[PDB]
C-alpha cells in the first residue's frame, strides 16, 4: 500500500 520510505510514523 504505502512505501515504507514514505512513512515517517512507522519504523521500516
Amino acid at each position: 500500500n504505502v512505501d515504507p520510505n514514505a512513512n515517517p510514523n512507522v519504523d521500516p
Partner: antibody
Amino acid sequence: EVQLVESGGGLVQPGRSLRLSCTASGFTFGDYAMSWVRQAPGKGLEWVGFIRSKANGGRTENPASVKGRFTISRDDSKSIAYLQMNSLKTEDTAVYYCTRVELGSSWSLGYWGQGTLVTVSS
Amino acid sequence: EIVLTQSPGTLSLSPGERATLSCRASQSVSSTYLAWYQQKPGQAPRLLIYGASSRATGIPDRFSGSGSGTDFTLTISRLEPEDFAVYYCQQYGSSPWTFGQGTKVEIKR
C-alpha cells in the same frame, strides 16, 4: 500551544556548511516526526526530508536534490531538530521551514515555524 | 516521483464567491495521503485539509476537500478577504513527498 522557531540561517558561501536549528515547545517533541520544507524566493514548496521519532527508529529520509549533502538530526533532551547543510550551492537559497509531522495514518505537516532565510552566494 | 499539477494557475474570483481548486496527480494517490496548505502573503504555510477531506484544527468550516486517485478538489464555499492567497496540495504516500506548484486566488476585476 505548538511553537517552532528556526534559527541559524544567513549568508553563506558556496561549498560551505550551515546547521539550522528548530526549537520546539508546547508539545512532547520526542513523540513526533519532524520535517524540513524549503521555499526558494518566489517559488513553491520543496520537501527537504524528515526524521522519525525515536520510538519509530529515529532514522531519516531525504529527496535526491539534497541527498548526501543535508542531514536531519534531533536532540530530544533539548526539544530541537537540526538540519546540517553541507556543500551548499546557490540553488539552495531559500527560506527553510521546520514542521511537525502529525501522528497516525495521515502524516500531514500540521505545524510550521516562521522560517529562516538561507542565502548562498559568493 | 508523483507530480502534482494544480489548475488553474491563477483563480480570479470576487469575495463571497465559491472557489474550486484542482490538484491532478501523475499517479494514483490514496486520499489518505493528500493535504492542502494555505500561504498568505508574507507568511508561512499552514495546514488546511489532510486526508483529502479532514479539516485541521481551527480551520473554518468553509474549507472542504474531496477526490481520490488522481483528481482532487479543494472547495472554499464563500471567499472571505483573507482567503485570497496561495494554496498548495501535497502528497505524502510515496517518496519523495511532493507539493503542487500552487494556485493563487486573486480578486477579479
